[PDB]
Design a binder for this molecule. Structure first.
Ligand SMILES: *[B]([O])([O])[C]([C][C][C][C][C][N])[N]C(=O)[C]1[C][C][C]N1C(=O)[C]([C]C1=[C][C]=[C][C]=[C]1)[N]C([C])=O
Lengths: 7, 26, 249
């Protein structure tokens, strides 16, 4: 969420 | 084997900014 | 980490992030010991009291990371687990005794400049280094104060004598445990904090200049507090369990 989507 | 030897540090004979703090406490 | 400091690039090429799928978030810290094995706190995966029961199909490992939140595009390595092994004697019940777990990667990882294994101690290194007054290094993406850093944090804490460690808490300390921090009357400070668990406590051998993981961020009652300390799983002591599960699988 605060995180960047991963492949 | 090669454990504990950082490519960008120990390998390059480059020291990190605070490591010396350790070795000194010994 | 509290009263820590941003980590230089490739300073801990062994630090690993435990990241869950659904929902996508940070669980803990871990460490690379070989190309397919990862060390961490058992409590990162099993804590019945908080209904925590993660299984390989719920986890992914992220190695080579500097930045906490972002997908470090050509640096970091994401991997899936084949299986989790928890010290059969992990005491989630009373005092997180034997708080250690090993995870197996479905596929090994190619090492690089940012990804590299840390050494597991040996009987003599531990005897030489696990001395009171000596310093170790702690890393992690955990709360910055008793909050989230953008980058990996770092700090150097001395080893506190057994008694002192003992006289700081109501919990029951064991032999598979050590504590570290500056004694309140020493000016300097710093600690480990929530989110840093499974995170390594290394030292540099003045003998072979290699870095060894001596501890695993285990527990502590509040972050950076006077007359209080951080507790770490004593890894040499659980060494023999490590090899076992490694020789079997
Ligand atoms: B880890 O990130 O998961 C975390 C490390 C941060 C503590 C650092 C302070 N020096 N460890 C924990 O969160 C553990 C696991 C569950 C509770 N816990 C604690 O440290 C407790 C104290 C405790 C509880 C049970 C047994 C031993 C110690 N801390 C608090 C505030 O509840």
């Amino acid at each position: 969420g605060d995180f960047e989507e991963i492949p | 084997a090669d454990c504990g030897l950082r490519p960008l540090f120990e390998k390059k004979s480059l020291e990190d900014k605070t490591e010396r703090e350790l070795l000194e406490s010994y | 980490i509290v009263e820590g400091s941003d980590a230089e690039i490739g300073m801990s090429p062994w630090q690993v992030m435990l990241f869950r799928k659904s929902p996508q978030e940070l669980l803990c810290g871990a460490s690379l010991i070989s190309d397919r094995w990862v060390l961490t706190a058992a409590h990162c995966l099993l804590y019945p009291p908080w209904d925590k029961n993660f299984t390989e199909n719920d986890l992914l490992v992220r190695i080579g990371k500097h930045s906490r939140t972002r997908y470090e595009r050509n640096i970091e390595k994401i991997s899936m687990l084949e299986k989790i092994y928890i010290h059969p004697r992990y005491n989630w019940r009373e005092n997180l005794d034997r708080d250690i777990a090993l995870m197996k990667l479905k596929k090994p990882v190619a090492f690089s400049d940012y990804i590299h294994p840390v050494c597991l101690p040996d009987r003599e290194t531990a005897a030489s280094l696990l001395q009171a007054g000596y310093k170790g290094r702690v890393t992690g993406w955990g709360n910055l104060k008793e909050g989230q850093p953008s980058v990996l944090q770092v700090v150097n804490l001395p080893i506190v004598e057994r008694p002192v460690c003992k006289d700081s808490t109501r919990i029951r300390i064991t032999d598979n445990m050590f504590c570290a921090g500056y004694k309140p009357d020493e000016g300097k400070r710093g600690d480990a904090c929530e989110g840093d668990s499974g995170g390594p406590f290394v030292m540099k051998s003045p003998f072979n200049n290699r870095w060894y993981q001596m501890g695993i961020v285990s527990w502590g009652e509040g972050c950076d507090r006077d007359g209080k300390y951080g507790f770490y799983t004593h890894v040499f002591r659980l060494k023999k369990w490590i090899q076992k599960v490694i020789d079997q699988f």
